[PDB]
Structure formats: C-alpha cells, structure tokens
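Reproducibility note. Readers wishing to regenerate the assembly model reported in the main text can use the exact inputs given here. Chain order matters: entities are listed in the order in which they were concatenated for prediction.
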Amino acid sequence: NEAGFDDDGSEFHEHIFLEKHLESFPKQGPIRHFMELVTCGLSKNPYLSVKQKVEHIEWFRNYFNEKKDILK
Amino acid sequence: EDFIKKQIEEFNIGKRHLANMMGEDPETFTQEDIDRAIAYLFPSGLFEKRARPVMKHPEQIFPRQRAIQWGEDGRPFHYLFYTGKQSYYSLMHDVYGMLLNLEKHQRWLIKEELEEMLVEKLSDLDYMQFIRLLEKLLTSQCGAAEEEFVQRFRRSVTLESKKQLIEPVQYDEQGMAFSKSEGKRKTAKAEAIVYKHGSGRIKVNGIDYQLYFPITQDREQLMFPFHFVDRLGKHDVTCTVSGGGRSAQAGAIRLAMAKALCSFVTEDEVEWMRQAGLLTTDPRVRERKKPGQEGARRKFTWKK
Amino acid sequence: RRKALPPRTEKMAVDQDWPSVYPVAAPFKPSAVPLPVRMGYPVKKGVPMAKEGNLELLKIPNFLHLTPVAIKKHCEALKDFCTEWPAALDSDEKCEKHFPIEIDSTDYVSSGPSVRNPRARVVVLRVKLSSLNLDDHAKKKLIKLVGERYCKTTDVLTIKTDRCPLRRQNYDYAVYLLTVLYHESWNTEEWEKSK
Amino acid sequence: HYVDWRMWRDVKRRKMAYEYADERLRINSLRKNTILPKILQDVADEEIAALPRDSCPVRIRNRCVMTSRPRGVKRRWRLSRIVFRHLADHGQLSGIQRATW
Amino acid sequence: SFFTKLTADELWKGALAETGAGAKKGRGKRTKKKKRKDLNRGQIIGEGRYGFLWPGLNVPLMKNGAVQTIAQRSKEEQEKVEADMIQQREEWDRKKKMKVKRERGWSGNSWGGISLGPPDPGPCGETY
Amino acid sequence: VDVPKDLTKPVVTISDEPDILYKRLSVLVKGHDKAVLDSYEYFAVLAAKELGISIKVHEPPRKIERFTLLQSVHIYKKHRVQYEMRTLYRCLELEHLTGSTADVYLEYIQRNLPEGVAMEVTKTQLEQLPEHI
Amino acid sequence: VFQDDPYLMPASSLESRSFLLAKKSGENVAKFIINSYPKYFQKDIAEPHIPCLMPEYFEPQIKDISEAALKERIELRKVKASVDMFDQLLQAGTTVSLETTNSLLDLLCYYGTWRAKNNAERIFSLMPEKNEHSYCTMIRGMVKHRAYEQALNLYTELLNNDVYTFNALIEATVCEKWSKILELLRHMVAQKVKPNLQTFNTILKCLRRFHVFARSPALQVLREMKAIGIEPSLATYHHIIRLFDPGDPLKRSSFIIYDIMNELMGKRFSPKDPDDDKFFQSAMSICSSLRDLELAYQVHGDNWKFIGPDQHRNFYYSKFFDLICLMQIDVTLKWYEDLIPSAYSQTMIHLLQALDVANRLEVIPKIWKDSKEYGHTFRSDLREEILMLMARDKHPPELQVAFADCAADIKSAYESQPIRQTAQDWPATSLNCIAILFLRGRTQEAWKMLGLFRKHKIPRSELLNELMDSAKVNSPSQAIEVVELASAFSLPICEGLTQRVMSDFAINQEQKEALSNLTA
Amino acid sequence: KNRAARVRVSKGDKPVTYEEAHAPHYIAHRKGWLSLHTGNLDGEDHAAERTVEDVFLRKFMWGTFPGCLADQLVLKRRGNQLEICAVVLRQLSPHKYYFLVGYSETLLSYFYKCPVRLHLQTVPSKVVYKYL
Amino acid sequence: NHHTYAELMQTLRFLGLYRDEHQDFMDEQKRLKKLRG
RNA sequence: GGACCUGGCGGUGCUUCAUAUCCCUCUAGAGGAGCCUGUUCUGUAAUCGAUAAACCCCGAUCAACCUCACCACCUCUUGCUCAGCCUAUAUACCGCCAUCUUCAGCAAACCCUGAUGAAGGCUACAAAGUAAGCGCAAGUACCCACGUAAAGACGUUAGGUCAAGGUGUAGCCCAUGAGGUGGCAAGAAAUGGGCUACAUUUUCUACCCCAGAAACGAUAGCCCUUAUGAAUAAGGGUCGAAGGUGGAUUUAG
Ligand SMILES: [Mg+2]
Ligand SMILES: [Mg+2]
Ligand SMILES: [Mg+2]
Ligand SMILES: [Mg+2]
Ligand SMILES: [Mg+2]
Ligand SMILES: [Mg+2]
Ligand SMILES: [Mg+2]
Ligand SMILES: [Mg+2]
Ligand SMILES: [Mg+2]
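Running the prediction on these inputs yields the following structure tokens for the assembly.
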C-alpha cells in the first residue's frame, strides 16, 4: 500500500522535530507558543510532508514579520 | 423423450469429468461427493437449495410425466383412458374387488404424495373418499397381500422423543463429582456447575446470591427448581453469567441449574420437572420496531 | 448466415488436464465447460434454466479453476522456493526469549484501481519489561511516566504509532522513541527524588 | 455538461473553497487562538471578512451526483434515495439486500 | 447529461402514454396517436457526422488482398450520404403512413360485407 | 504427447542478509457469501497443509448494517423500505512462519482471490533489541 | 488471444488473421483518439502514474531555435528538421551543437526517390564541421536508401580525410566479383574494427546464391568465426543451410548439420539478430525436402517466439504435418487431434492419402467433420478426394450407415451454392461414389439421386456396375423404369440391359422392350 | 401495490428473463448481484466512484454493442484487474464483434488507468425464463 | 466531470459509434418541431 | 314504454362471524396549562406542492448565508451545455407509491346452457365445466415448523408526484433564461402531532434498589459561558407563574 510515494526519502525526525525550523524567535513569547502548537499539530499530521510543513512555517514567518510593527 | 437419455448420458460423462477434476476414482463416487464438489467449485449465497446450483440425475430432476398412453394406431393401452382419472379409477376398482372378495370369504399417505406417485391430480374430497375406502378395508380382516398393499401407501409415523436430554456427570481432582449445564435467555447466557455431595452456599460470578440479587423474586426464581424437586440444602453450585437484565440473568441461571440437576436426579423427576415447565428456553424476545410505527406494535394516532 | 460449431464437450476426454484448460481465474463459459450442472429457481412442472444462458453462474464467483489437483501441483512446485522455519523456535516462551520485541503492522486489500489507503501507516509493538529493564528505579520511573500503555496483568508494555504516513517512518520513529525513553528513564531529577 | 446551473454553482464553490482552504484554516486559527493579541485577532477577522464569497466550506452542499437532489442523499454512495433504490431494486450495485429481519 | 439520459423502451412508454386514465375507462382521447418508431434498426452503427472509414465495421476489412487503413470521408460525399439517409428515412415514413383499403361491404364503418378468409387450419390437419 | 523437454525455472538468489521471521500471520476475510468464504478458507488451509505449516480456523460473528429509506417520492412517511449490508468474517492464523514463505503464500493467495472479498493481514514478527538501549 | 465461445471462435487462418488485425486496428483507433483528445484522459486517477497509459505529446513548442533543435530528436519527423536547418542557416547562420547536427543527419538519413535526393543534396550546406560520425552516417543513409556509388564516394572521401558503417559499405560494394570480395574481406580483417559479425551475416545474405566455390569456403569462414569465438551460429549457419540449396540431396552434409543443430538445440539460445524469423520458415522448408521424422522431432525455453508471422507459422505447421503424414500413423493422428484446435487443403489431402495407405477407414469421417466444422465448405477438391478414397471401401458392412450419413452431409454442402455455378460440375465428377454409398439400407434416396444425375452425365464402368447392383437388389417395374431409360439414353446401359432383360424384365410389357430393340 | 423492477403481468405473450421476472426482494434470496466489488463492505471507501463508473460502463457497453445484447452485464473486479461478462446474439459478424471488443477494452483501459478484460457468450436467440 | 463524460460521448456519436437513443429521440422531435414551426 | 342480464345499494331477511375490532369489558393516552414543531388565517415585495379516510415533524434521514425555486435592486445575451427554462398541463406520461389489502380472487385458451340475448356454468352417495399463467399459499429472512417482517395480483379514487430525473403538447427563446447584494421566513387569533409536568409510585442525594431528607413544575424569559462557523446548539446564575389530571369527543394495543 506504499508501492511508490516514498515522500522523497523524508524522515520521521524531519517531520516531527521542527526546532531547526524554529530559530528566529525567543522561547517565551506568544509567537513561540503559537508556533510550538503549530509544530505539534504538524508532527501529529501524517497527511502532509516536510515540504508542506515548511511552507506553512515560512508563511507564518512572513506574515507575522510584516506584522512585526507591534510585538506586544 | 430421447432428450431424457441424452441428459442421462451427459450427466454420466459430467460426473466422470468431475471425479477426475476433484481427484477421485470415478468408479467409487457418491451424490454427497457431487454436492460437496459443486458447492466448493461454484459457491452461492442463495438461501434456497432449489435456487442454488445443483448437479442431479435427470430422472429426479424432471418430474414424472405420463408416457404416450395410446399406441400409434387406434385403441389406447389402458381401459379407462377415454375418461380422466384412469389410474385412480383402476385402483378403486381393484380395491372394491378385494373388499367384496373378503366379504364373500366372511401412517397415512399425503395427497400430493399420491399425486407424485401417480401422474394425475385430484380433489381433496376424492382423496377423502379414497381414505374412507382404505379405512373401510382395514376395519375388517386383511390378509398379507392386503396389508402389504396398504403399507405400500402408508408411511412412517416418525414419532419424536418427548424427553429431556441428560448431561453426563463428570469428575475432577481430589475425587470431586459434579455436572455442568448451560442456559440462555433474551440477551443473557450463563453456565452452572452443580456438586451433588456439596451443599449450602452458592456462588455467582464469584459473589453470593444473597448480595448479588438485592430483590427477592430473583432468589425465588433461582430457588424454584430446587423447591420442586425438594432437594434444597443438599446441592451447592457455581455459575458464570453474561447478560444485561436482572430477571434475564435470573431465568438463565434457573434454566442452567435445572439442566444440571436433571442429570443427578432420576428421569422420573426430570419428567415431573418437564410437566412443571422449567426445562425449556423462553423463545420470547423483544419484538422488532417497525418503520412506520411508534413501536413494535403501536401505530401513530389515526387522525381521520 | 454463419453457424457456430458444436461445443467442446464431446471433444474433451474424461482424462484431461483441467488445471491446464483453466489455469487462471476466468468466467464459466458453458461452451468450454462440459458439466451439465444447472442453477436457477424452478417453475412448477419445470427445472432450473440450463447452463447455456445461465448468467447467474456468471455473476456468482467462479472457482472451476484452482481444483485440489491444481493446488497440489502448484504447492509441490513452489516448495522448491519455500524455506524452513528454525526448529529451535517451537514455543511462545522460547521465541519471545530469543526476540522479545514484538512488532506488528497490517493493511487491507480491496477491489479497485487505487491501492493506497491511510490505514497502511499504523503499526504497534509490544514487549514485556520483566527481563528488559534490569533495574527498579528506572522501572518505577517508566511505569509512572506511561499512563495506560502498559498491562501488568499480562505484564507487557504495548505502544502504537501512526503519526507518520510511511510504515518505515513509523518504524524508525517508534525505535527512536523507545531508545530515548529508555535513556531518559535511566537518569532522574531532584524534583523526582523529592516525592 | 453538468446537470444544472445550481450544480455548476456548487462546483465553482467547491473549487474556490479548495483553492482557498489553507488560508482559511490558517487565519481562522489565528482568529480563534486565545493568547495572541486581541488587535491581531481583529486584523484576522476583517481579513476573513474581506476574503471573497463562495470561498467558505459552509456554503457548499453535499448534493446528489445524478439527479442534483440536495436533500435525501447518502454520504457514502453520494446518490439520491431514488437512484439508490432504483439501482438496488434492479440489482446493479453489489452486496445490498432487503431487510427481511 | 449522459448519466441523466436513459434507454429507449421506457422513454417510448412515457412518451406514448398507452396507460393511465386516457386508455382506462374507454375515454381514450380525441383521435391523437403517436406511432412507435425504431431508430436503431434504421442506420447502421458505422456512420456519424465525421465519416471515418472503418475497415473493421464500415468498410470491408480486405480489398485486393490488402489490409485497409483509416481514412476520411470528405464533406461532399458526406453530404451525399446524409441526403441519401434523409431520403431513405422519408421513404420509410411514407411506407409506414399510408392508406388502408378494406373492401367496402354494406357501408363504411360497418363490418357486414367483409370476409375474414378461410377458417384456421385444424390441429389434426383440416384444410378449410 | 506434447510434453516440454526443458522446463524454464526462474532464477533465485539467497542474499547475504537473513530472512525475517513472522510470529503470527492472522488474516481476516470479509465477504457476502458464507459459502464463498468456506470455499476460500478450504483452499487456504489446504495450501497451508500441503506446504507444511500450522493452521487455525474460527468464524467471527456476522455484522449487519441496515437503514431506512422512503418508499415513495413526494409525500409518504409512514411507508418506508429498508436495506442491509451484511459482512461475514472468517479468520485464519499461521504461527512460526518464515518471511519468504509468508511472501510467497501471500502473493499466491492474493492472485487467487475471488472478487467479492476483502482481505486484512495482521503480521507479527519478533526481533532482537537495538544497540543504543 | 482469441475468445472462447464457438461463434466468435476463429475457425480458419485467413479469418483469424483478419480478426486480430481488426483488433490491432481498434488499438490504433484508440491511439488516434487518445492523441487527438489528450485532455479527456489527462486525469491521473490511478495512484501509480504510468506514462504507458498517459496520453501521447508530439506538439512543437513556441519558436525557439535551441529548444526546437533539442525537440527535433523528440518529434521524430523531417519537416521540423527542414525548418530548423532553414532557421539556423538563413537568418541565424550558427550551429547549436555538433552533436545536434549529427543527430539531425542521423534522423534525415534514417528517413531518406527525388525526396531522398533532395534530402541528401541539402546536407552538404551543413557547417564545415563534419566529423567521422557525420560522414559514416551519410554513408549509412546513401547505402540503405539510395544507390551505392554515392556511398563509395563518401567512403573514399573519409579515407582521404565503424562496424555497421563498414557493413553497409560492403553491402554497397557487393550488391563473379572474386577479387572485390577477397580484397574487401582482407582489408576489413586487417583493420582493427573487430566487427560484431553482422558484416559476415550481410555478406552471406549477398552470397544467398552461388556455386560450391563459395558454398564450401563458407564452412571454413564459419570455422574461423568459431575459432575467434563470437558467433552463436544463429543466422549465418541457417543462411548457409539455405545456400546448400539442389539437384541431389547431400546426405553427408545433412547428417553433419543435423548434429550441429542438435547441439544448438541442446544448448540454450539468446536472440541477437533481427533475421531469426526467416530462420524458422526456411529451416522447415529445408526440413521438408530432407524428409526425416527424428529430424522433425529435433527441430520441434522461450524459443517459440521466433515463429512470429502467421505466414511463417503456416508454412512450418504445414510442412511439419505433411512430413508426419508421409512418414503406423496412430501417434501422428494423436499429435494431430491434440493440436487441431490450436493449429489451422493440402495438409488434409496428405492426411487423406496417409489414412488410405494406413487403411484406417473409421478415422476419415471424424477428420472430414472437423474440417467442415472449421472452414471446409464451398470447395469440392477434398470432397472428391475423400469420396474416391472411401469408395474405391465396402469392406465394413455396419459402416455403410456412416457412409450414408457422411454422403448426405456432403450433398447438403454440395447443393448449398447455386449462384456461384461451382456446384454444377461437382456431381459430374464425384456423384458416382456418393450414390454408391447411398445405395449401400436406404435405396430410394440413391435411386432419385441417380435420376437427378442423369437428368442434369458422363457414364462410367463403375456407374454401370452401380446400376446393375441396384437393379438386381425383386421389383421388375421399379428396376426397369430406370435401367431401360438409361439404356435408351446411352449404349453401355443398353449392352447391360441385353443381359438384364433375361431374368424377369422382358416378360412384363413389350413397349419398353420395343424401345430397347429399336435403340439396339 | 408497489412498482419496482418488476414486469406487469400480460396475457402471456411477453418473454422475460430470470432477473427481469424476479422481484427486487429476491435479490439475495433468488438472485445474484450483477456487480462484485468490496466498496459496499465495512471500512472500505470509493464506493460512490465504483457505482458511478460501473453505471457509465454499463451504458457505454450497451451503446457500443447495441441490438446484440440480450441481458444485463456482470462486473467482476478482483483487486486491480477488471473483468466484464456479457451475453449477446449472433446477429452481427465476428469481425464487428472483435473490433468493437478491442475498441471498448482499450477505451476502458485508458480511461480508468486499469487493466480491463471482457468476455461475451453468444446465443442464437434470447433465453426466456417465462412468458408473462 | 460530466464535462469530460458528455463531451466524449457527443464526439463519439458524431464519429458514429455510440447509438444514443435519447439524443436520437431528442433531435427527431427537434426536426418535427422545426418542421411544424 | 313492457319484460329481462350484471353490479352497486337497502334505516333488507336467515345463519356464522368480528382476530383489539362492534359493543359490553382491560390498560395507557389526546381534546386542560406551558413548550417544540406543522397547518388555516392576518399583514408583509416575499416560494411551490399534498392539503378526508388514503396530508398536517407531509417532499425535509433539516431553511442562520448555497439549500433559495420568491421578491427589490444591479448586470450578462450563443448564453458550461451542437443553448437553457423549478413555465402551464400528474386530465399526456414513464419512473416511484397511498388505498380496499387486517382482501382472495384475477384469468389468456377451450366446451356447454339459454330457441346460438344481454349473461351463466355450484351440488361428490355428485347434475358441465376443463384450465395455461398471476396472486394467495408454499418456501426464504430473524430465534423454530409458531410469531414478526417481507409479499400482497386484476382494478377504483382522471388519487399524489411535469419541483428527484426525463419526456409528449403548448409557451419564453433581451427571458418566463443566467449571474450577485439584501432581507424574506412575525403572530390579535384557531387547530393538529409530540415533550414536560399538575405528585407523594412524587423531588434531592451515593449506589442502582434494605438509606437519609423535602413536602412539586421552565426544554419558556433575562444575563453570561462555550460548540462549529467567515458571519442555531449544550452548560451556568436569576426569574419559580400557568398548572391541582381534563368540554362534548377521541386514539393505540
Ligand atoms: Mg362513407
Ligand atoms: Mg407498501
Ligand atoms: Mg438558503
Ligand atoms: Mg426560472
Ligand atoms: Mg393522476
Ligand atoms: Mg410489509
Ligand atoms: Mg406470501
Ligand atoms: Mg387528479
Ligand atoms: Mg458559531
């Protein structure tokens, strides 16, 4: 039932451990809270791959970085 | 008509081929083998046997049809042909001849069974008249020929047992005799082991009845078997149960205790218990709910 | 205008390689099959419809192929390829001793063009901690950590994994999780010493 | 050649909701989260309000495939009750029996 | 759509409406009757708008002992064949709808002076 | 009379790696016809016996799901019609079974399926402990 | 590949050919529809993506000289290449790559006749940069599509400046020429090409016909092939077997080649030469001339693919069954009755004469019935043969019923086809034995059949014998109204009637006797 | 009085087939399902796709072998491979039959991206179960 | 997509392979209607 | 106008019956109050259809926006459709069903009686009826052979359904088609089906049955929380009345 579709040789740690994708914010802030919850949900999700997860991450990064005007 | 023999020989060669396929010598081979083979080679979820696939001999496949009863020229063979019911009339004539012969000297067979024995239909009251003739013959003396003539038609009574099965006693370690039995109910199923020499307390799933059944009627029900036989405090029992309803479990354990005690007690007492009516599983179960009805039997209000 | 030749029934002999004439799964084809078996609900003074136009036999599953003889031949042919089980492994205690870590996956198979189905990813594993931990502090620690993944009546810890779509991803993640779990149960903390 | 214009509208709505699905999920999470700023939740809420119509998965309908009947449709087979009964009576589909229970 | 479409027999039934109150009670209707027709019998399966020449079904497979190949029917002979089919359908409809001439007996709409021909032959064989 | 001389046998290679050993192959077949299931399980158990491996058989309960639809089109709620999907289970367990035997037997059965059947394998293989632990 | 039901069952070689050709035509129609409307099947519903099922794309992209040149070798045609050469030479005047020019020349030489002349004279404008590959591919094209002087000029030019290049050059030189062949072989072996022996195969193809002075040297050339140890002896061996063709069979060389091909069969084969299809057919052609049964059995893993075309398969099976018939024949008819459904007039004629020499009379009916069931209809050659062979016999008395039955079936087939006019001359040739067999139980049928025959004649001695036996086998008037009429018709029936009238015929009435006297 | 997949009783001059005479409450009791797949069983999916595609296939085959068929189709999907079974009349020629067989087989294969095969049984005249 | 389905079937009837009884009825009554105005 | 055939009807006779159906009888309910949800009616620019038995939690196993088919406003004109139309016609129809049916008759094809009339065809210790086939029945499903389901023909209500879908006829085919914003869907009132209780067999508490207290009732309203959603539901605080077991009548077993 997986004859093909190897997910480009992806790895479970690449799916779950997103701490390397999480570098550009401290350990305490609400953005940290939200992005930690996001990484949790993504690791729980098997349907999507590391590609989709990193696109999600980059989208969040872009949006709250153009909303960096507040940081409150 | 040759079609029949053609089908017969086709069936023979097909039986040979089928024996070859299933891997058995074609000489030794049986209808049971035919049935099992066709079932394995062409299964079908059809419920009716007549609808399921069957490989059968043509003689019993086709119903018996009356062959040509008149020759190719002129007269017919039998002497009642110009009227119907020729075989029945000839049989009645022979019967009446035997009756008057005996006069000067001095179970039953179903209608459709007689029909399929013959090649003719008839009426219910005609059948009744034939039965009247037979019983009139039998009210008087009858020789060996007459008895065998009548028993050609008469069939086996096929009487039932009208008896309660006896479960076998058993023995286990440290020389302990006992007997196990099983009972069921609406949705509860249980099984109980009775020790004949033991007596006193009783267990239910590892709990005594006094505190497992807070209500009194359940204990009354499970006591009712012992009370009827009158052996009350001379038998201890264990039992396991699985069910939803309290009274359901009660009836299940009652039936199981009875089916265990009938083994120890005499068959006379078992017959007495059957007459009492505590040795039969209740066939009654919650009726289904219908789609248009508010319940299994109650309809919506007829509004008019 | 054109006329069809009579069937192969009279042509086929009583001694015949039925496994060869029906090697694989195929329809009934009464023209090829000589058996006069019929199937159908009979009418009063009637019989089931003959095998020729009997599409009931067609719609039902087909098992004329794969007779016991064909099965025998295929099995004795494939025995050349089949291997032997280790005779030393002949009991549950012995096999669980030789290889305590039990692991089991599964997958359905269904008719259709597609074959992927998400349930292929799930897998689980089992192991008894009676012989694996070799200590007591880490044992109490691990049994305090795990909430319901154990069963002391059976004396086995069992764990599932489905977080990954791939079976091999699931396997590797389960192995890494077990390893890190053992390594973290090995040590302790001061708030854990204070209880 | 869809059955009717309402089926056409349903298909357009399905495609729009699909191609805007990720954004709806992300900004709806950003809205329904609690610890983040109220002003940011408001930003996200007017963003969703400015999002286009026929993009939400609530406007679509699990309509029938053959007869375009919205009501009385089985989710598993997706067919209307009438077509399902037709096929079952004629024995076209598989493994369905009348409830003689 | 293709799925919404359906076969011909039930279509003709619903279109003609031989059943219902009309036919029942003997009320009928005021001398309007659609006659059944069969379109599948008329045209052979091969031809369509775009006339690909089919060696398998439309053209004989072999000519001069040589396998044929798919080709195009140009618009001129396409229109020719279409006009031929139109004329053929017109002739069919003409032959269908025509007069009926039962010999005039005592009067029109009367079954008096008409003969039904000889009686039917008997089972044993009796030529009447 | 036509009997081939040289029977073409496919090539086989015993790779240096060891074969995996499955503890229990438990297959569960869902069908609509208990007779078809009986024939299928007879086939399977006969093949397993001939190959020389263990076998177990038991019949789990029949599951049914029934549902109500409207009998008519426009306005009739009292009058309905019902339907039911019946699935029948059959189980077969095989213990102490080598990996290659598992593979070959599974492909054999998978090619020998009938149509109206679904087949669910649960494989159980034992292995030794990792090195990091 | 063929269906199972009897109606669709192809029951003859030509109709089966037409049938699977119609199937292939449907396959081509499918290809056409898919490559005409790809967007319909564009959906990749199947989880495993398969380009074999994906629609096919021969669509030139937008104007892009470099990408267009890269797409040249993808589109596989010549108009694109002409247009690309135009765009690169007229306005651009530059080459995208020497490899691209080489591939263009490859395609144009493969595609090639004034069109070939133009394509070959439009390649000299190509940029000066023309390496060996270019020159030898030009040689390939000019050989395999045009005359040979151009290839020779190109080879001389290359010398002034590959295996199958020199192969094509040798083909061109060859296609009496003793010194030519010799110097060619010598310098070819001198060069360090080390061919794949396809040069040798081609020179054999050219030596298809020659006397012993090149047939026998082929044996030592093959021994040299073996010494160098390259050839599997798959095609050149068979070609020399064919070159052996012949006023007198050569039994010694025949036995030698028998042993050779015996070890070749014993060992396993692998295909290397595209011409292994004529191998089968011409090998069996030589086998038919040889006439040996152990030989046929020897000629009989997956080596059955080399039969291929239905024509070669037909020739092979025909010659095979012919040799088997003209070899007891119980094993032969066993093999036959085994392969008849799988297998497909001349073969049946040989079968009939084999059954005749065997004297197995009881078998011919079933064979005729099988032929009729398959395709034996609307032709009376084999009917005449079977009738003559079966009524030369009368020795089985009980089999006269089967005689009558097969005769009735033969007549049912004979009288089918009036419109064709071919059934008119069939009774004149073969009605005699048919009517004799009908006479041999039922007699009135044969009586009225001889009536129809004589009222269509060509009398015959066995026809006289038939008339005599029929007349003698009780009814004077019934015999007279036939024999007297045939006597008044022709003279030999009259000289027979002279004796027939002695027993009881002349006493009945004198008017017919008077007619006989007048005719006599 | 219910009207569902059952033929009205006529004077006795309506030839009818087995399934067409039998009622839709005889499906499992005295009939078989024309199609065979596993989407109907529990746990599976794609059943709607199976049904729509098999209906489309039935219509397409009825219209690409028109006037020759005399019964409904039988569909048999064993895993990947799809098999069809039909009953036809010997009206048209084997040329026609084989050509359209190959045509429709290729069409189904390229449409469903699935291995497809079909078989057809010839009959001189439609087999009648009863006269209704 | 009924788009794909119906487009393919229409093109194939134009080729003249699928005898669409429903479309035949429809366009026959269309001819009759345009004849009778 | 006289006499007849068949059916219906009889507040028409005799006999046998009525299974939860006629009554006498048995139980529990509806018509009392509130609430939920339909219907009639009022008004609104604001769908449609059924609307005695055989409709009134009916199309709907669902209407906050599509569902939406109405309406106001604003746009498209070969318009996804080799166009389209939820436009009229269920009194053209198919397809699908209520009904007597909690029936047992319907019958092609033959013969006979009536002077060869419509029509009829029963006597078993037997006098002209024979019968294909359908249905009943039988068998199958659930747990049996009973029971329940299922089945339940011919026909009646021109019964319902052109709005599941298609189609005959007649129409719009710059529209009576198509697209996007908005609200539309309330009750001075009457009625129907269901829920809640009007009590102490009750109410609360732990347990589901050996106890202890009270001597009730909101699924309505106000406020709040949360559920999904871009924009009705469950829970919590307050409110603690009507209500005192039903007006002729009527429902189910
Ligand atoms: Mg007049
Ligand atoms: Mg009903
Ligand atoms: Mg809406
Ligand atoms: Mg409109
Ligand atoms: Mg009506
Ligand atoms: Mg019912
Ligand atoms: Mg019944
Ligand atoms: Mg009406
Ligand atoms: Mg919300």
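We highlight two features of this model. Residues 1, 4-6, 10-22, 24-25, 27, 29, 32, 34 of chain E lie near RNA strand J (CB under 10 Å from a C1'). The CA atoms of residues 51 and 73 of chain E lie 5 Å apart.
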